[PDB]
Amino acid sequence: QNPMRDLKIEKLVLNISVGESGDRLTRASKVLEQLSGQTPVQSKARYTVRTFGIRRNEKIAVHVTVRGPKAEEILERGLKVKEYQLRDRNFSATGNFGFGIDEHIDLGIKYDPSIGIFGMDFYVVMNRPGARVTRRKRCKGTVGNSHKTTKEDTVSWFKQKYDADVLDK
Amino acid sequence: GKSHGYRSRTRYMFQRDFRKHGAVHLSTYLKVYKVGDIVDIKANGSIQKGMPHKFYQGKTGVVYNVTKSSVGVIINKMVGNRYLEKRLNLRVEHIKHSKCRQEFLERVKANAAKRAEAKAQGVAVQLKRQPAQPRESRIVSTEGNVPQTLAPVPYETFI
Amino acid sequence: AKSKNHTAHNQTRKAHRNGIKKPKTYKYPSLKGVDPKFRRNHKHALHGTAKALAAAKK
Amino acid sequence: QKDAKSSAYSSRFQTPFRRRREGKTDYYQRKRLVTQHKAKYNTPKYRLVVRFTNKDIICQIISSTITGDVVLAAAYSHELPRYGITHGLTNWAAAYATGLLIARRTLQKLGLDETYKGVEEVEGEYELTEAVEDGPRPFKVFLDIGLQRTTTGARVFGALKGASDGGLYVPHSENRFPGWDFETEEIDPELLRSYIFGGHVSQYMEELADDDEERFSELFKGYLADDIDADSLEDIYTSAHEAIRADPAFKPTEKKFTKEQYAAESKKYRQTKLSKEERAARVAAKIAALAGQQ
Amino acid sequence: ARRPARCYRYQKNKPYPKSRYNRAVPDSKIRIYDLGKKKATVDEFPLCVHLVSNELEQLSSEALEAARICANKYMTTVSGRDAFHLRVRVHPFHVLRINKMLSCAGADRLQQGMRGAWGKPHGLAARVDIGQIIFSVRTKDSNKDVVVEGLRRARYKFPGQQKIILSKKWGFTNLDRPEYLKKREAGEVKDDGAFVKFLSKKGSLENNIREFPEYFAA
RNA sequence: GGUUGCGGCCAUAUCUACCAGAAAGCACCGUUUCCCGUCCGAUCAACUGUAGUUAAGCUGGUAAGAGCCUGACCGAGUAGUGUAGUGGGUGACCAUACGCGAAACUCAGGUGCUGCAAUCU
RNA sequence: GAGAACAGAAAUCUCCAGUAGAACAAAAGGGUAAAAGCCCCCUUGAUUUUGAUUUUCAGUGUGAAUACAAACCAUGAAAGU
RNA sequence: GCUCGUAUCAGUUUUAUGAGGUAAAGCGAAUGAUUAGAGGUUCCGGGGUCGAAAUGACCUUGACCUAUUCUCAAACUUUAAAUAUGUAAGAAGUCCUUGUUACUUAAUUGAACGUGGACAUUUGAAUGAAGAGCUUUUAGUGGGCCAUUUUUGGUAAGCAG
């Protein structure tokens, strides 16, 4: 019996991690806003490391989280670029997944010479109705193992929708 | 050189407890204290305001004053060859009712009831307490209790 | 020329010579250090009860 | 070693309080809500607890004792159909109505009903319960929100407003009320009054009727069935206010059954624990079958 | 050029381990504590003989190493390297101190005497009790006299009085010979690498049947 | 007896992995004009109660379960210790006398009790 | 721990565990989880008057601190602080 | 000397009730040390093979796991004594339409202090009490040393603490 424990898309996070801040970060924010219909947020560094050439609180990345039909549309637009060949490596043990793309023009964005070529990372968070139990304020809980999203059922859901395919490796 | 601070050598004294850390339960706040109440002092290491000194930790005193969030305690402290009266302003988290006085009040009521029964009948109620008396004569039988003879055991290494 | 630093030797004997008798306890302890709002109240209430007792049995 | 909860971990684990584990109560706020001035020796400290489940509002007046909290008088939203509020039992206006009901009930219980009549002609204006010459002070209660989020235009403050216009002196500020503008520190009694009487629902009714009829059929179906309109829900809210003030006596239900019958049926249905002898028997059966290979 | 052991024989100070406060102490002289066939199964070496201390004192790391080397060499030379298992059951953790300065005649001019006499670490010792095991050898019963002879040889390297007692236990286990034998004829014991595991009457039956197959698979 | 709000004691209450839950309640759930906060109506805010429940939460059962709790006249009167001797011993230490007296391979049992208000084939 | 595209054991990291193994100016010890930690909004109680009290103590001083009174304020929806 | 005259006492026990973190114990309990022994994808120290190529293949420390007790801690601890230690065992005490108040309460509800009432030959454990409460004033002293015991530094000392 599966009344409402069916998989559903919680959120899609589009993340572009620039090397630095400034014009490049502004360009990435502009492209993310144009793609997602909403402003993104800039992620500063968690710590500094001289060997990696970054400073603490330097606005390294930019990211946006979308939900619902917009998340579905962006997911299929990125899967068009990927040509629907993912992997069990690409899928996670918690049921979520994601994939990285380059040359965001393939998503359908009109090229502008200023913006240039920015890559990005989609990460889709799979779930089913009831995550409010673990995300609400009063009476916090944890879902049961029956209700937990997993590798097998998330790959089954992904390869059932759009009948996509996954590699053994 | 030498250190004698306010919380000197209180490392284990104010240590909270094992698996009793954190927020304190609300009965300590709901308890009320009146002037003349007898209170035990045991500092809560978690609450740092109105904390008693390590000398008064474990001391029993009498309430002389009551304020918004605390209480005044009278403690007799031995200074040299006499006792001096010390007045503390301790919080209810460090204060707790003493049960010796409660037991004595219960005994007072029990003596009142026994005296009322004596006024009723006159059967030598004998209010005063007595120490453990020597045991009276008794007879011990051996039905299914025949004495079992014991002997000192020989030495063995056992290791 | 070093000397003895500290000792509590003989101190308890000295204290117990004429020593450690308890402090003298009183009915009506001092109200010093007691809440002054309460003390204002107590002044007014004691005034009132003395007046009532005088009126009842002059 | 991801799922590594060792015996030492479980042994040194200190569980929170039961209500903290259940995520029901905030003890940091509860301590300040229930801790009394020690020179106010035993005088109870009363909290107007307001809780918002789905399709129900619970409003209680509780004081705290050692053995547990003690309820003075409680008003639930599910008894508002008795006064004439059948639809929208959780909305802002229902919260105001049930707060008014609990205020009236508590005043009647304490004998403070004729005095401190409250506010009968409400306007959405912020007012305090004035001191009465040579008369008992108003019953004082402090709002208890628990884990609910204090924010502008919340039904917890709706129930607070209900109680304050009921007559309970519940200390509050007007800046969490709907109609408050952050830019100008001035309340909007007109917008507050519309929220009091269901204007935020009547205007939604009108907008839905004039722009999307399918949503009007999908929701507001009960309103359609009982023929309530954007002019009439204000009427029913005023009528409910009047009935609440008229009779807050809290007549309860007949339960249709007997507590013993309830206990019998639920006990018969409920699962039962095994005895220790039969537990040992189950272990022995497992030993003889699974371990022994017959 | 080390101080005689008579200076550090007795347990005079509180335990003084190497810690965040010593943080500079010499290495222990003894680093090997198991010798012989240490991989042998519990059934293989049924007899246990203990070199026990009759005195509350301190055993130096130097003395422990010397006694271990002597007993190990004797066991090897008279019965072979795989006919026994020797275990040192005392680890030298107490750190001995010394106040040593530059050595010269007429040093009283700059010695400072007993001012600031706190010592620096210069040794390690094992703090043993009365009845505390110093050495334990497990072997076959045919090797009893050889093992007691080797422990007697090792005894000369220690200060104080030591006894040699043949344990009633089976090898290095906590069960005497008959109780171990009974638990072994039952399925209660399972041979781990060198030591043994016991089947508790408590626990999950699923794990008790995953492990210990023979006890239930009768 | 189930359930809810508010609790008291704060694991006998916690943690794992299964199973069950009638009715009511609780919850997930549906929506975005208005009060309201974020990239995100997913938290939080509001509106409706109409479209399904063991799917979760929740509750209760199951486990020679981990923990935790209470006892034991199998361990242990052991370790330690107050007091005593012109006791033993080179000493290290130990024994005796009059008293007090401690974890766990252990073993047994247990796995929330309850206060106030409200509702329930 | 399972994770993205350059990208790597140590950027960007979505979930799952997570009794604090982090952080709290500094030494160490105590203390702290819907906080005492990290963010955000407001702010000047680091204010006034004078007393009482604890520690060191001679129950002298100094230093530090504790609970009130009478004010004036900040913060919060409020209890409160 | 003063005020009194057997008690507003006690280097003691008992009963009741607190506080402690030392001795002991513990380390298949946290921290920190610490010895050994099965099986683990070499993208995850360093060493050879089917051969132009690596997940169809083995051994060497153990990085990282498996709960197996070898041994420990003045500045480690769940537990936890003995001795020592706070308080109480009454007449200034225990129970009642009450009386006062500007404090407190929603409220004659509370808080404090009381008037009026019920408590006797046992007035609320033991033992003792060659009198109990001290008031003033002043001497000398302010190098100490030695036991059984607990103990720090030191190899130790008729050493130092």
Nearest CB to B76 within list C16, C23, C33: C23
What separation, in Å, do the N-terminal and C-terminal C-alpha atoms of chain C show?
79
Rounded Cα–Cα distance for residues E126 and E134 (Å)? 9
Q: Does D35 touch chain B if contact means CB atoms closer than 8 Å?
A: yes
What whole-number distance in Å separates Cα of residue A45 and Cα of residue E96? Answer: 50
For CA atoms D20, D21, D22, D23, the dihedral sign is positive
**Out of E205, E208, E217, whose CB is closest to D293?**
E217
**Helices D92-110 and D232-246: angle between axes, nearest 10 degrees:** 10
Place of tokens 């069935």: D225
Strand partners, D47: D62, D142
Distance CA A131, CA B151 (A): 73
Report which of D200, D192, D198, D202 is spatially closest to residue D123, judged by C-alpha positions: D192
CA A60/CA A47 separation, integer angstroms = 11
D and A touching (3 or more beta-carbon pairs closer than 8 Å): yes
Identify whether the C-beta of residue A5 lies closer than 8 Å to the C-beta of residue A147: yes
Extract the tokens encoding B32.
Answer: 């009320």
Tally of CA atoms within 13 A in the half-sphere of B93 that contains its CB: 19
Number of DSSP helices (H) and strands (E) in chain C, helices first: 2, 0
Q: How far apart, in whole angstroms, are the C-alpha atoms of residue B115 and residue B125? A: 7
User: Per DSSP, what are the bridge partners of residue A100?
Assistant: A121
- Contacts for E103 with CB less than 8 Å, ≥ 6 apart: none
Give φ, ψ of D102 to 5 degrees: -70, -35
Resolution in A: 2.6
Q: Is E106 left (phi over 0), alpha (psi -120 to 50) or beta?
A: left
Q: Tell me the chain B residues in contact with residue D13 when contact means C-beta distances shorter than 8 Å.
A: 19
What is the distance in angstroms between the Cα of A139 and the nearest Cα belonging to chain D? Answer: 4
Are C34 and B85 within 8 A, CB to CB? no
Q: Do chains A and B touch (3 or more CB pairs under 8 A)?
A: no
Are the C-beta atoms of residues E88 and E72 closer than 8 Å to each other? Answer: no
Q: What is the DSSP string of B33-75?
A: --TT-EEEE---TT--TTPPPTTTTT-EEEEEEE-SSEEEEEE
What whole-number distance in Å separates Cα of residue E21 and Cα of residue E214?
52
Q: DSSP alpha helices (H): ranges in D168-198? A: 189-196
| CA/C1' separation A164–H56 (Å) | 30
SS3 at position D128: coil
Sequence length of chain A is 169
Q: How was this structure determined?
A: cryo-EM
Length of chain C: 58
Helix (H) or strand (E) holding C53: helix C36-56
CA dist E111 and D203 (Å) reads 99
User: Starting at the edge strand that comes first in sequence, how are the strands of the sheet with A97-101 ordered?
Assistant: A41-43, A61-66, A8-17, A120-127, A97-101
> CA end-to-end span of chain A, whole Å?
32
* Residue corresponding to tokens 């209790």: B145
Contact A63, A69 (CB under 8 A): no
Measured between alpha carbons, how far is residue D144 from residues A12, B24, D31, E145 in Å?
38, 20, 12, 84
Strand, helix or coil for residue A99: strand
Token pair belonging to A4: 């409402």
Length, in residues, of chain B: 159
Q: Tell which of D283, D290, D294 to mutate to test the E interface (max E CBs under 10 Å).
A: D290
For chain C, how big is the Rg over CA atoms in Å? Answer: 25
- What is the spatial distance, in angstroms and rounded to an integer, between the CA atom of D69 and the C1' atom of F48? 34
Count Cβ atoms below 10 Å from residue D36 Cβ, excluding itself.
Answer: 18
Sign of dihedral through CA atoms D13, D19, D23, D26?
negative
Strand H lies under 7 A from the Cβ of residue D7? yes
Classified as helix, coil or strand, C2 is: coil
State the Rg of chain E over Cα: 22
Give the strands of the sheet with D56-65, arranged side by side.
D68-76, D56-65, D47-53, D142-144
For D103, E7, E43, E177, the CA distances from E132, given in Å and listed in that order, are 78, 22, 25, 21
In the β-sheet with E133-139, what is the strand arrangement from edge to edge? E34-36, E84-88, E133-139, E47-53, E162-166
- Asked if D131 reaches chain E (Cβ–Cβ under 8 Å), the answer is no
In this structure, the strands spanning D56-65 and D68-76 are: antiparallel
Instruction: Tell me how far CA of residue D33 lies from CA of A123, D62, D64, in angstroms.
Output: 45, 11, 10
CA-only gyration radius of chain D, Å: 26
Alpha-carbon gap: A59 to the closest alpha carbon of chain D (Å): 31
Which amino acid, E80?
G
Q: Which amino acid is at A109?
A: I
Whether E99 and E81 have beta carbons less than 8 Å apart is answered as no
Kindly list the distances between the CA atom of residue B133 and the CA atoms of B129, B130, B136, D184, D204, in Å, as whole numbers in the listed order: 11, 8, 9, 85, 88
Residue A117, CA distances (Å) to A29, D178, D208 in order: 13, 48, 46
Q: How many CA atoms lie within 13 A of B157 on its CB side?
A: 16
The reply to whether C36 Cβ lies less than 7 angstroms from strand H is no
Query: Nearest Cβ partner of C33 from B72, B76, B81?
Result: B72
Q: Which residue has the tokens 């009551």?
A: B66
Q: CB of E123 within 8 A of CB of E26?
A: yes
Measure Cα distances from B59 to A142, B43, D270, E66 in Å: 47, 10, 53, 57
Question: CA gyration radius for chain A?
Answer: 18
Looking from the CA of E2 toward its CB, the CA atoms found within 13 Å total 14
Q: Which tokens sit at D125?
A: 């204006």
Task: Give dist(CA B45, CA B2) in Å, integer.
Answer: 24
Amino acid identity of residue D234, one-letter, is E
- Token readout for D27 is 């003890």
CA E72 – CA E85 distance, rounded (Å):
9
AA letter at E218: A
Distance of alpha carbon D155 from alpha carbon A78, whole angstroms: 43
Which nucleotide comes closest to B109 if you measure CA to C1'?
H94
Q: In Å, what is the CA distance from D101 to each residue of A94, B77, D249?
A: 49, 58, 9
Q: B62 with B103: CB under 8 angstroms?
A: no
B-contacting chains (≥3 CB pairs under 8 Å): C, D, E
Burial of C42 (0-12, 13-18, 19+ CB in 10 A): middle
Amino acid at E68: R
- Cα–Cα distance for residue pair E174/E167, rounded to 1 Å: 10
Neighbours of D27 (CB within 10 A): 18
Give the residue from D68, D241, D40 showing the smallest Cα distance to D140: D40
**How far is Cα D108 from Cα D246, in angstroms, rounded to an integer?**
11
Q: Are E122 and E97 in contact (CB under 8 A)?
A: yes
Contact A117, A27 (CB under 8 A): no
3-state secondary structure chain E: CCCCHHHCCCCCCCCCCCCCCCCCCCCCCCCCCEEECCCCCCCCCCEEEEEEECCCEEEEHHHHHHHHHHHHHHHHHHHCCCCEEEEECCCCCEEEEECCCCCCCCHHHCCCCCCCCCCEEEEEEEEECCCCEEEEEEECHHHHHHHHHHHHHHHCCCCCCEEEEECCECCCCCCEHHHHHHHHHCCCEEECCCCEEECCCCCCHHHHHHCCHHHHCC
Please say whether the beta carbons of B125 and B117 come within 8 A.
Answer: yes
Q: Report CB contact under 8 Å: E205, D290.
A: yes
Distance from the Cα of D165 to chain A's closest Cα (Å) equals 29
D20: closest chain A residue by CA: A139
* Chains touching D, CB cut-off 8 Å, 3+ pairs: A, B, E
Q: How far apart are CA E162 and CA E131, in angstroms?
A: 9
Contacts of B46 (CB under 8 A, 6+ apart): B16, B21, B22, B23, B24, B93
Q: Within 13 Å, how many C-alpha atoms sit on residue D86's CB side?
A: 10
Q: Whole-number Å distance, CA E64 to C1' F75? A: 34
Half-sphere exposure of E217 (CA within 13 A, CB side): 7
CA B70 to mean position of chain CA atoms: 21
The helix-helix angle for D199-211 and D189-196 (nearest 10°) equals 80
Separation of alpha carbons B91 and B51, rounded Å: 7
From first CA to last CA, the distance across chain D in angstroms is 37
Residue B67 corresponds to which amino acid?
T
CA–CA distance, D160 with D98 (Å, rounded to integer): 10
E26 touches strand H (CB under 7 A): no
Alpha helices in chain A (DSSP H): 23-36, 69-82, 132-135, 151-160
Q: How far from E19 is each of B107, E23, E122, CA to CA, in Å?
A: 57, 5, 15
- Helices then strands, counting H and E runs in chain B, come out as 2, 5
From chain D, the residues in CB contact with A139 under 8 A are 22-24
Residues 99-158 on chain E lying near strand H, CB distance under 7 A: 99, 114, 117-119, 126-128, 132-133
For B141, the token pair is 């039988």
Residues of E in contact with B159 (CB under 8 A): 50, 52, 131, 133, 165, 167-169
Q: Is A122 exposed, middle or buried (0-12, 13-18, 19+ CB in 10 A)?
A: buried
Question: Is strand H in 7 Å reach of the CB of D258?
Answer: no
Neighbour tally for B52: CB within 10 Å: 23
Longest CA span, chain A: 55
Q: Which two tokens stand for residue B114?
A: 């026994």
Name the 3-class secondary structure at D59.
strand
In the DSSP assignment, the letter for residue D221 is H
Contact B39, B98 (CB under 8 A): yes
Cβ contacts (< 8 Å) between D66 and chain B: which residues? 27, 30-31
Tell whether E81 is within 8 A of chain B (Cβ): no
Q: Which residues contact A1 (CB under 8 A, 6 or more apart)?
A: none
Angular region, D134: left φ>0, alpha ψ -120 to 50, beta rest: left
Give helix E61-79 / helix E144-155 axis angle, nearest 10°: 150
Q: Report the residue of E164, E168, E174 to disrupt the B interface, i.e. the one with the largest count of B CBs within 10 Å.
A: E168
Distance CA B94, CA B25 (A): 13
| C-alpha count within 13 angstroms, C-beta hemisphere, residue E53 | 22
Nucleotide with the nearest C1' to B67 CA: G68
Contact D38 B67 (CB under 8 A): yes
Contact E95, E127 (CB under 8 A): no
3-state secondary structure of D50: strand
What does DSSP say about strands A165-167 and A85-87: parallel, antiparallel, or unpaired?
parallel
> Does E209 sit within 8 Å of D293, measured CB to CB?
no
Decide the pairing of beta strands D47-53 and E120-128: unpaired
Q: What is the rounded CA–CA span in Å between residue E210 and residue D237?
A: 70
Indicate if CB(C58) is under 7 A from strand H. Answer: no
Sequence-ordered strand ranges (E) for D13-164: 47-53, 56-65, 68-76, 142-144
Cβ neighbours of residue D141 closer than 8 Å, sequence gap 6 or more: D46, D47, D48, D61, D163, D168, D169, D170
Cα–Cα distance list, D135 to D106, D114, D167, E37 (Å): 18, 12, 15, 97
Of E52, E133, E168, the CB nearest to B158: E168
Residues of B contacting chain C (CB within 8 angstroms): 64-67, 72, 74, 76, 78, 80-85, 87
Name the minimum distance, in Å, from the CA of D294 to any CA of chain E.
10
Residue of A nearest to D19 (CA): A139
E strand residue ranges, chain A: 8-17, 41-43, 61-66, 85-87, 97-101, 120-127, 165-167
Chains that touch E (3 or more CB pairs under 8 A): B, D
Interatomic CA distance for residues D97 and D172, integer angstroms: 18
Name chain A's partners: 3 or more CB pairs within 8 A. D
Token pair 């019958």: residue: D261
3-state secondary structure of B88: strand
Please judge whether D290 and E209 are an interchain contact, meaning their C-beta atoms are less than 8 angstroms apart. yes
Length of chain D: 294
Structure tokens at E50: 């203990």
Provide the token pair at A125.
């968070």
**Rounded CA separation C37/E41 (Å):** 83
Q: Mutate which of C34, C37, C38, C41 to test chain B, going by most B C-beta atoms within 10 A?
A: C34
CA distance D167 to D48: 13
Bridge partners (DSSP) of residue A14 are A64, A122
Q: Alpha-carbon distance B125 to B111, whole Å?
A: 9
> How many CB atoms sit inside 10 A of residue B155's CB?
6
Tokens of B80: 């040299």
- Residue B136, amino acid: E
Place of tokens 């607890």: D49
**What does the alpha-carbon distance between residue B26 and residue C27 come to, in Å, rounded to a whole number?**
35
Separation between the CA of D28 and the C1’ of G68 (whole angstroms): 25
3-state secondary structure of B24: coil
- The rounded radius of gyration (Å) of the Cα atoms in chain B is 26
- Say how far apart CA E160 and CA A134 lie, in whole Å: 67
* E76 φ, ψ (degrees, to nearest 5): -65, -40
Angle at B47 between CA B45 and CA B53, to 5 degrees: 60
> What is the rounded CA–CA span in Å between residue B103 and residue C50?
36
